[PDB]
Amino acid sequence: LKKTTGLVGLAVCETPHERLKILYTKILDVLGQIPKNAAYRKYTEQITNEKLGMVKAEPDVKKLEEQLQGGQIEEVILQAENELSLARKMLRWKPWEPLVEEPPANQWKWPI
Amino acid sequence: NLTLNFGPGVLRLVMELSGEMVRKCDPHIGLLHRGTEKLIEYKTYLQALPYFDRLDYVSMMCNEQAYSLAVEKLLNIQPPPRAQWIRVLFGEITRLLNHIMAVTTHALDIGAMTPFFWMFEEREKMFEFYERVSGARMHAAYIRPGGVHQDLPLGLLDDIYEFSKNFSFRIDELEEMLTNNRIWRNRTVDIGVVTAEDALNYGFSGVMLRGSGIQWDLRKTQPYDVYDQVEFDVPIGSRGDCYDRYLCRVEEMRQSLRIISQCLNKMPPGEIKVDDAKVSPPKRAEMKTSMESLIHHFKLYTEGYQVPPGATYTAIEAPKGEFGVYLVSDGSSRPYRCKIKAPGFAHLAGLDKMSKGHMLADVVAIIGTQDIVFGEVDR
Amino acid sequence: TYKFVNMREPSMDMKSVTDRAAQTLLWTELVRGLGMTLSYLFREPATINYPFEKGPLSPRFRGEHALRRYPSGEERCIACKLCEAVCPAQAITIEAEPRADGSRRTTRYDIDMTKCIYCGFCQEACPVDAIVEGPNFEFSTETHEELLYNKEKLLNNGDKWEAEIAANIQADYLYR
Amino acid sequence: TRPTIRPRNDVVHKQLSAFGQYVAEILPKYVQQVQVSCFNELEIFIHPDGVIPVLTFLRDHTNAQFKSLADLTAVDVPTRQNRFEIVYNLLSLRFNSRIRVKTYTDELTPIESSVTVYKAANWYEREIWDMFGVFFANHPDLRRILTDYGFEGHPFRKDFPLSGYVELRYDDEVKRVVAEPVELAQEFRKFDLNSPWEAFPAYRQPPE
Amino acid sequence: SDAPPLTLEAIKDRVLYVLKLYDKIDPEKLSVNSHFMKDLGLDSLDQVEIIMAMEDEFGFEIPDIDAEKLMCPQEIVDYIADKKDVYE
Amino acid sequence: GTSVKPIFSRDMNEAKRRVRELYRAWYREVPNTVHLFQLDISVKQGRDKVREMFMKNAHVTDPRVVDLLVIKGKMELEETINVWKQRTHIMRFFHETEAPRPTDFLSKFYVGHDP
Numbered sequence A: 001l002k003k004t005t006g007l008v009g010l011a012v013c014e015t016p017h018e019r020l021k022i023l024y025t026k027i028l029d030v031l032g033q034i035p036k037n038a039a040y041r042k043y044t045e046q047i048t049n050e051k052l053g054m055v056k057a058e059p060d061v062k063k064l065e066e067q068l069q070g071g072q073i074e075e076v077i078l079q080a081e082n083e084l085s086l087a088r089k090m091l092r093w094k095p096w097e098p099l100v101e102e103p104p105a106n107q108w109k110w111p112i
Numbered sequence B: 001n002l003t004l005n006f007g008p009g010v011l012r013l014v015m016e017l018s019g020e021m022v023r024k025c026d027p028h029i030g031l032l033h034r035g036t037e038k039l040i041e042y043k044t045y046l047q048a049l050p051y052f053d054r055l056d057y058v059s060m061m062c063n064e065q066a067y068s069l070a071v072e073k074l075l076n077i078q079p080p081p082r083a084q085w086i087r088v089l090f091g092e093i094t095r096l097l098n099h100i101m102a103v104t105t106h107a108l109d110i111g112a113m114t115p116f117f118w119m120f121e122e123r124e125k126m127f128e129f130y131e132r133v134s135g136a137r138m139h140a141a142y143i144r145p146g147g148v149h150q151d152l153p154l155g156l157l158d159d160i161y162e163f164s165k166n167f168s169f170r171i172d173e174l175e176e177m178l179t180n181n182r183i184w185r186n187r188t189v190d191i192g193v194v195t196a197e198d199a200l201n202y203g204f205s206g207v208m209l210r211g212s213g214i215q216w217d218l219r220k221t222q223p224y225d226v227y228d229q230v231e232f233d234v235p236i237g238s239r240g241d242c243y244d245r246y247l248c249r250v251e252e253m254r255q256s257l258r259i260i261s262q263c264l265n266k267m268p269p270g271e272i273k274v275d276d277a278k279v280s281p282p283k284r285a286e287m288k289t290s291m292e293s294l295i296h297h298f299k300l301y302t303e304g305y306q307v308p309p310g311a312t313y314t315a316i317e318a319p320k321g322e323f324g325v326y327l328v329s330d331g332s333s334r335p336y337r338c339k340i341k342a343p344g345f346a347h348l349a350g351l352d353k354m355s356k357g358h359m360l361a362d363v364v365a366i367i368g369t370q371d372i373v374f375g376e377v378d379r
Numbered sequence C: 001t002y003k004f005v006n007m008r009e010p011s012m013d014m015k016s017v018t019d020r021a022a023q024t025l026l027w028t029e030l031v032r033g034l035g036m037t038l039s040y041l042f043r044e045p046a047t048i049n050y051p052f053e054k055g056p057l058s059p060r061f062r063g064e065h066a067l068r069r070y071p072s073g074e075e076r077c078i079a080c081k082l083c084e085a086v087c088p089a090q091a092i093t094i095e096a097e098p099r100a101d102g103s104r105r106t107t108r109y110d111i112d113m114t115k116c117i118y119c120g121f122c123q124e125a126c127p128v129d130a131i132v133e134g135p136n137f138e139f140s141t142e143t144h145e146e147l148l149y150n151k152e153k154l155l156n157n158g159d160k161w162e163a164e165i166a167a168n169i170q171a172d173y174l175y176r
Numbered sequence D: 001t002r003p004t005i006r007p008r009n010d011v012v013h014k015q016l017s018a019f020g021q022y023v024a025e026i027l028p029k030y031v032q033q034v035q036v037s038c039f040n041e042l043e044i045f046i047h048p049d050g051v052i053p054v055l056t057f058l059r060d061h062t063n064a065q066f067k068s069l070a071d072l073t074a075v076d077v078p079t080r081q082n083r084f085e086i087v088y089n090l091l092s093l094r095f096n097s098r099i100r101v102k103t104y105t106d107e108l109t110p111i112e113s114s115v116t117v118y119k120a121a122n123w124y125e126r127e128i129w130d131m132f133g134v135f136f137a138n139h140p141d142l143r144r145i146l147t148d149y150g151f152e153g154h155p156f157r158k159d160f161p162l163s164g165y166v167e168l169r170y171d172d173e174v175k176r177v178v179a180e181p182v183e184l185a186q187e188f189r190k191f192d193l194n195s196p197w198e199a200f201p202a203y204r205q206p207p208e
Numbered sequence E: 001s002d003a004p005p006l007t008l009e010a011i012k013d014r015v016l017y018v019l020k021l022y023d024k025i026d027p028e029k030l031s032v033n034s035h036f037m038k039d040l041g042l043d044s045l046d047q048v049e050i051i052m053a054m055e056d057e058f059g060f061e062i063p064d065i066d067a068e069k070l071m072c073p074q075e076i077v078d079y080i081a082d083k084k085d086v087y088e
Numbered sequence F: 001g002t003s004v005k006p007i008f009s010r011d012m013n014e015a016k017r018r019v020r021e022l023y024r025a026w027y028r029e030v031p032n033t034v035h036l037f038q039l040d041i042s043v044k045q046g047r048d049k050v051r052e053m054f055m056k057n058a059h060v061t062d063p064r065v066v067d068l069l070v071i072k073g074k075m076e077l078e079e080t081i082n083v084w085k086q087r088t089h090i091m092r093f094f095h096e097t098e099a100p101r102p103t104d105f106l107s108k109f110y111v112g113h114d115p
C-alpha cells in the first residue's frame, strides 16, 4: 500500500473498492427519488453506472485509477461524496421545474 | 483575551489573543486604495496600461502581459513571435525579481537580513536590464497590447546571458544561509499549514496551491504566448507549510533561470509589434513620410483604437499566483469596465484561517509566506 | 513535469543518526552559515562613490522634460496637442494661437511634474520631436511650486541639455 | 487568416457549447441563457434565485466540479431596470476549464451570499457592497473593506463622480485631519474621443 | 435595611421625578395621566429616550415590544409594578 | 402588483421597530464614545447629533430603504464601538472647519452665481 497521496489533508484510503461501491449505491438510491424525466437524474445515473461498472470489473488499484480518469482514488471517493451531497441538495431544490421568470426586456443586451 | 490593533507594506491588523495564542486575526485594508478601476474608465486602453505597472509593483512586467493578453483577445489579433519570446523572457526575469523580493523580505522580517543585500545587488542588475530595454527601472510600460514598444538594444542579450550564468551561485549562497538552518526551519516548518481542499475553496493560487501538493500551473495547463515551447519543472510541496513554500519559491527561481536560458538561445528575428497600424502605432520614419502612417499615428495617440464590444476574463501565471483581468468593452476606445483580480486578495482573506492556533510571531511568517503586496490587494 | 521539494526520507541507520546527533550538539550548519558570512566579509563591496561615481544609464532613460528646437533656433513644437491628448495623468496643459508672423505656436505649455508619471508617452506621440524626456534626474526641489513647469522653464531645460539630448536621440532613433 | 490575426479553436468552441447545453438542460429552473464567445468563453445567464443551487452544482457535479472561484465582481449599467450585474468566474482544475455565471439585481433587492459554496467569496461580496451598494443576505460580516471609515456613497457606480464629494486636509485650529467639499485647482479635462463613422458593422443595432 | 420596601407611591415619585428631569417636558404641564404624544407633544424617539431613562432609573431592562405601548406615566407605573409585583 | 422581495422587514412597523432598536443602541453608546475618543463635545450635543442624523431620513416611506439605512447605521455603530474610527472620523459629523453657508437670497446673490 502507498502512503502520502500527496495532497495535504487527504488521507490514504485502505480498501477503496468497498467505499466506492457503497458511495455509488447510495448515490443511485438518492437519484431514485428524483423524477424519471429530470435531466440531472438520467445524466448522473449514467455517470454513476459507468463508474460503478468500472470499479466492479477492475481489482487492481492503479488500473482502476487509470480507467476512472480521476486519479488518486482517494479524490475519486471525495468526488463521489460531493456528488451524493449535491444529489440530496438537488432533490431538495428541484431545479427540473420550469423557469421561475424571464428577465426584463433588455436585461442582457450588450452593448448598452 | 486581549485585543491589539497593530496599525501602520502598510497593514492594519486587529487581533484577539488568548494568552500567547492567536484566537482571531482581522486585516483592515484600503490604506492603499486609489480607485484604479474607476480611473481606468476615463482612459484609453494605452492610457490605462501604466496602471498595471503600479498594481503589483514588485513584478511590473507580468501585469503588463496580463493586460495586453486581455486586450489582444478582445481585439482578435496576435503579437509577432519575437514579441512573444521577449515577453516570456522578461516575464521570467520579472519572476526572479519578485521571488528575490519575497524571499529576502520574508527572511528579513524573520530577522535574517544578510541575503536581502546579497540579492538586492542582483535586483539592481535586473533593474538595469529593465532600464536599458525601456528607459525606466521599475514602472516600465514596455509590454503593450500589440507586442512590445521597442526592440532590444544590440548588446542586451549578451549582458543578460552574462548575468544569468552567475545567478545560481547567488541562489546557492541564499540556501546556505537559509534552507538547513535550524532556526529558520523552526520558524517556518509546520507554520500556516493549509489543506488542498481548503486552499481550493478559499481561492488560493500559485505557490499557495503547490505547497499543499496541488499539481497546477497556468503556464503548463493554460499556456499563453510561447510557454508551450519551453521546458521546465513545477516544484511541488508536501506539507503545506511555510518551509515547503519557501523551497518551492527557491526551486522556481532556478526553473526561471532554465527558461531564461531557453529564451536566450531561441530568440527569433522579425518585428516586435503587430503589423497592423490600426492597432499598433507605425514607425517614426513611416509616420514622417507616409500619409496613412501619419493619420494612424494621430488617431492612435488621440482617440486610440476601438475594441469590439465584449467581455473577457484573462489570467496568467503571475509570480504571486493567478493574476487576472475581467475586461468589458462597449465598442469604443475606452474600456467600460476593468476588474482586476489579485491573488493576494484571496491569500489575505485566508490569513485568518491560516493563523489559527499560532503565536503572534507566526503571523509575521504567514504574512511573509502569503507574498502580499498592498497595491494589488487594494487597487 | 513536476518536482518534489521536500520528499526525502532520513536514513535510520546508526551512522546517519549519529551524524544528525553530531549536527544537533556541535552546531555544524550554523558554523557553515558563519563561514558563508565570513567569506562575504572578505570580498570587494559593490558600493559606488556617489556623487563622484554614477549608476549606469541608457540613451532610452527618461528624465526631466525638455522642449527642443531646430538648428535655426526656432522651436519644434507646433501646438498639435498630441502629447496633451495622450498624457495618462493629464499633466500637460497647452494653449496656442497664431504668432505675429502667422506661425502655429504655443502660448502656454505647462507640465505638472507632481502629476507626471514619467511614462514617456508624450515624447513618442510627438510628431516633430518637440517634447522629450531628457537625461537629467537630479532636479529635486525645496517647494511644491518650483515643480510646476511653464513653457519658459521647459525651453530653458532644452537649451541647457540639448547636446546630451541630441546625442541620446542619435543613439536610439533607429529603434523608434 | 494571416499572421496578424488571432487563430480560432473550433474544438474548444464545440466542447463549451455542448457543456453549456448540458448545464442548461440539467437546471432549466434558473438558466435564462447560454453563450459562447468567439474567443471560446462560456457564460451562463441565470435568475437571481439560482445563485446558490447553480454554483453548488458547478462546484459539486462529477462532470463539472468547478472547485475554484477566480473572481466575483459587479458591473453597473444605469440604463437597465436591474442596475447591477453580478459576475462569477469559476475554474475547474479537473477538466482544465473556465466558466462564467451572470445574474442581476437592483439597488434594493438583496442577493444570496455564496460564502457557503466558496469561502473566497467572503471578501469579494464585501468589496461589491463597498463599491456598488449591493447587499448580500446571510453574509457572515458585511461591511466596507476598501473605502475610508464613514465614507458616503459607492464610488464604482457610474453616477458617482470621479473625484468624489469630499477631500481631506490638516487643520491647525482643530489640530486634526478634516474633510471639506472638493475643490480642484485644475479641473479634470473631459475628452470627447468617440468618433462618428462606426467601427464594427457586425455589432450594428436595428434602427427601431 | 439593605433595600427599602417599594410602594406604588415611591414608584410614582421616582417616575414623575425622572420625567421632571427630562428637559422637553416642563414640570407644570405633565401629570400622572398625561399622554406622551398629545398632552405633552412628543415623538416616538422622545418616548424611546424616556424608556431608557426608566431603565437606568429602575435598574432593569424593558423589551422594545412592550416598551412601545407605555404611553403614559400611569401605565409605566403599572408596567413597573407588574414586573416587580408590588403590594401597594 | 408592484411585488418586491424583502430585505428584513415586511411592512413599515417592523422597520420602525428596527429603527428604534438602532436608536437605542446609538443613544447608549454616545457617552462611552465621548469618553473613549477624548472628545471636547458634550454628551448632550452628541445625542443631538444622533437625533439630527436620524431625523435627516424621516421622510422615507419604503421599508426596504428603511432597513438598508438601518444596516448602514449599524455598520457605523460597529465602526464606532470597535474604535476602528479615529477622532477625525467622529468629528466629521460636526463640520467645525466649514464656514457657514447663508441661505437667504441676497447673500447667495452677493457671493456668486451658485443657487
Ligand SMILES: CCCCCCCCCCCC(=O)SCCNC(=O)CCNC(=O)[C@H](O)C(C)(C)COP(=O)(O)O
Residues within 6 Å of the ligand: E043, E044, E045, E046, F016, F019, F022, F026, F030, F046, F047, F049, F050, F053, F054, F055, F057, F058, F059, F060, F061, F066, F069, F070, F071, F072, F073, F074, F076, F090, F093
Ligand atoms: C456622535 C454622533 C455620531 C452620529 C450618529 C450616527 C448616525 C446614524 C443614523 C442612521 C439612521 C437610520 O439608520 S434609520 C432612518 C429613519 N427611518 C425612517 O424615517 C422611517 C419612517 N420614519 C419614521 O418612522 C419617523 O420619522 C421617526 C422619527 C424615525 C420615528 O417616529 P415615531 O416616534 O412617530 O415612530
Ligand code: SF4
Residues within 6 Å of the ligand: C083, C086, C087, C088, C089, C090, C091, C092, C111, C115, C116, C117, C118, C119, C120, C121, C122, C123
Ligand atoms: S511622461 Fe507621461 S505622464 Fe509625464 S507628461 Fe509625458 S505623457 Fe504625461
Ligand code: SF4
Residues within 6 Å of the ligand: C076, C077, C078, C079, C080, C081, C082, C083, C084, C094, C122, C125, C126, C127, C128, C129, C130, C131
Ligand atoms: S510638444 Fe509635440 S506633441 Fe506636444 S503639442 Fe508640441 S508638437 Fe504637438
